Every structure is written in structure tokens, then in C-alpha cells.
């Protein structure tokens, strides 16, 4: 496939969708330590942003080589956040629930 | 600040070696709080380290 090397820790961003339905896969489901992988049949469209308007400052460190750091902030500071639609998420979570109950 | 809860930048200043020579000057920048750790061996909060 065209592999997307995107990095994430708790949710598989930008990944390719599941085959035909939500499928659970694990080395040994009965074990606690084996981190299970859940593959979803439909996506949940997450969006994130940072409302602050940073600007970058050119500090110089020794001969020839620069170093960049955040200067002032031009807007009014707010909280960086992410947004997910609730109706998609709860339904998908219940679907994962039934797929777990297949094995439990 | 008096009220509210938002991210904040902890303005810091440092004595960098300047662009020319081994002369020195003072400079200022902003750093997100996880990048900064209190140093002081004594009970003082005016002096800070990078997490490196």
C-alpha cells in the first residue's frame, strides 16, 4: 500500500479504513498486556487548531547559525483545542462495544 | 492574572553569546511551560532551566 507514516499515541490518524466491518485484533485477547488494535469501518472527522497568533524571532547563537523562538503574541490568547462530533463518536463507540462483546 | 484559565508563556531572558566575536548580550524569548523546569537548590523561583 501507500503507507502513511503519520505518528500518534492513542488514535490512528489519517489511516486507511477497515475492510468491511469493525474488527478487533490482538496477540492474545485474554492477556491484559497485549495492546489490542481496533480498526473502524467509518471515520470520525477530528479537527484541531491553536487560536493564538504567534510570531517568530531570530536569535543568533555563535557564528553563522541562528535560533528561532516565539516573540510577542498579537491576538488575545485562547485555549488550543480539538473538536469531534458527538453523534458519530457515541455510535462508533457502541459499535466497538458489540465487537468486543463478540469475544466477551 | 486575576481570573480565568488559559495557557501562558512564561517570558524569559538569557545572556547569549552574541552574533559577533565571543562578546555577550542579553536577549528575551517565550517558552511553553513544559519546556521549562525550576532549578533553584534554595527556595527561589526566579531562576529556570530548560528541560534539556
Amino acid at each position, epitope marked *: 500500500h501507500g503507507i502513511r507514516p503519520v505518528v500518534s499515541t492513542q488514535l490512528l490518524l489519517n489511516g486507511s479504513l477497515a475492510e468491511k466491518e469493525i474488527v478487533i485484533r490482538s496477540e492474545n485477547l485474554t492477556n491484559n498486556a497485549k495492546i489490542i488494535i481496533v480498526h473502524l469501518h467509518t471515520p470520525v472527522e477530528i479537527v484541531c487548531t491553536r487560536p493564538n*497568533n504567534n510570531t517568530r524571532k531570530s536569535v543568533r547563537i555563535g557564528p553563522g547559525q541562528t535560533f528561532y523562538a516565539t516573540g510577542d503574541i498579537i491576538g*488575545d*490568547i485562547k*485555549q488550543a483545542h480539538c473538536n469531534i462530533s458527538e453523534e458519530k463518536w457515541n455510535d462508533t463507540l457502541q459499535k466497538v462495544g458489540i465487537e468486543l462483546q463478540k469475544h466477551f | 492574572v*486575576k*481570573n480565568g484559565t*488559559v495557557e501562558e508563556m512564561k517570558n524569559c531572558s538569557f545572556n547569549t553569546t552574541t552574533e559577533i566575536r565571543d562578546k555577550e548580550k542579553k536577549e528575551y524569548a517565550l517558552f511553553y511551560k513544559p519546556d521549562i523546569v525550576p532549578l533553584s537548590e534554595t527556595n527561589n523561583t526566579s531562576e529556570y532551566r530548560l528541560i534539556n
Partner: antibody
Amino acid sequence: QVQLVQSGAEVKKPGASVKVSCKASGYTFTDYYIHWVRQAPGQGLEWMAWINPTTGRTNSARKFQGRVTMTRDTSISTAYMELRRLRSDDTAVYYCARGGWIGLYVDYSGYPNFDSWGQGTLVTVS
Amino acid sequence: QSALTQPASVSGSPGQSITISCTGTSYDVGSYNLVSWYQQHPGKAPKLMIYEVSKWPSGVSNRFSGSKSGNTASLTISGLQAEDEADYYCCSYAGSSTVIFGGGTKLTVL
């Protein structure tokens, strides 16, 4: 109805300083921005600054940077404007107005949607 | 100072239609969705009728409408009653942390 009340009038000498007040009522006084705008007689409007009630961090046009001080007193729902080095040009009418809503996730600070004014206070530099 | 140039004045009579306009710059009017219009007449503080390009505030004047294209924003009047006599002002978010106003104009009626 929502309304803001203002100082009566001011007279000052050149090189002096003037303080004007802006007290608001009828709405939760901490939930909205306050915009300050200036009106010279028979001439165009000049916008001056904005302030978030919940915090400091005022900002103003470059005409008045390093020369205007801005605060609000949360106890009595009153905003205050300080102009510290007057000129004869500054003779004008000063207004305060309620800005957009103070969102916690979106930057509405610069939005020109302010819809409730004070009476206007006349400042004369002579 | 202000880039929001505006005409000086206009005039009209009952039943006519008049369009005011102000020209800004690619930095402020040609980049943001935050132009607004205000009016004032002597003895009164100014008043809002168009905010965020074309939307209306409480009550006043469904009659008025406006839009913008390029660096130009416009306010349109039709019917043109006597109460419309006022000094109309162009306003827009200027980028950065600043709003900026235009020169203003008088509608000479009726």
C-alpha cells in the same frame, strides 16, 4: 435595557492627563469586550483600544502606544481610560462600547460588532 | 493613516435608491470577513445596522443591505426616507489586533 454610563466632561491643559470612566449595566459585565473610540468634532471616527474584562492585556492603535493606560475595576463594573500626555489635537469626544462575546475557544477580540455605546464625554485641551 | 477611503457626501429625494461605498486594501478588506457599517446624526451616539458584511442587528432597517468585493465594501439604500439623514461610516477589521474606520459620509435627505 443594556446601557453604559459615562463621565460628564473634562477640561485640561496641554501636557496634562485625563481619566474618563465607563460603567455598564443590564448584562453580565464580565462577558463582553469594551472598545474605546474617539470622535473629533465634525470629523472621522478614531478607534483607540480594546480590553478583556477577565484579564489585563490591553491593545491599542500605534498612535497611542506607550501613552495610554488601560484597566477595568471588576468591583463596580467600571472601565477606565487613562491618557497621560495630552496635546491640543486630542480635543474630542470619547466613547466606550460593548464588543463581541468573550469566547474561550475563538478570537472575537478584533471583530467590529459593537452595538451599545456610552453618552460620549467631551474633553477639551486648552 | 486609514486606508478606508470613502466619498464625502451624497443627496437624494423620496423613492430613490443610493449606494454608499468605501475602498480599503488587500490587507484588511480584501482578506477578512469583518466589514461593518455605522451611522450617526448630531446629538446622538452612532448606531449599528450592518455587521459581518450583510447581517442585521436588532430591529433597525431591513431596508439597508450591503456587500463587498475586492477591496470595496458597499451599503445600499432604497426608498430613502427622511430618517435616513445621517453620517454613515465605513468600518473593518484591519488585521493584527486593530479595527480601523473610514472617513465617513453624509446622506443628504429628504
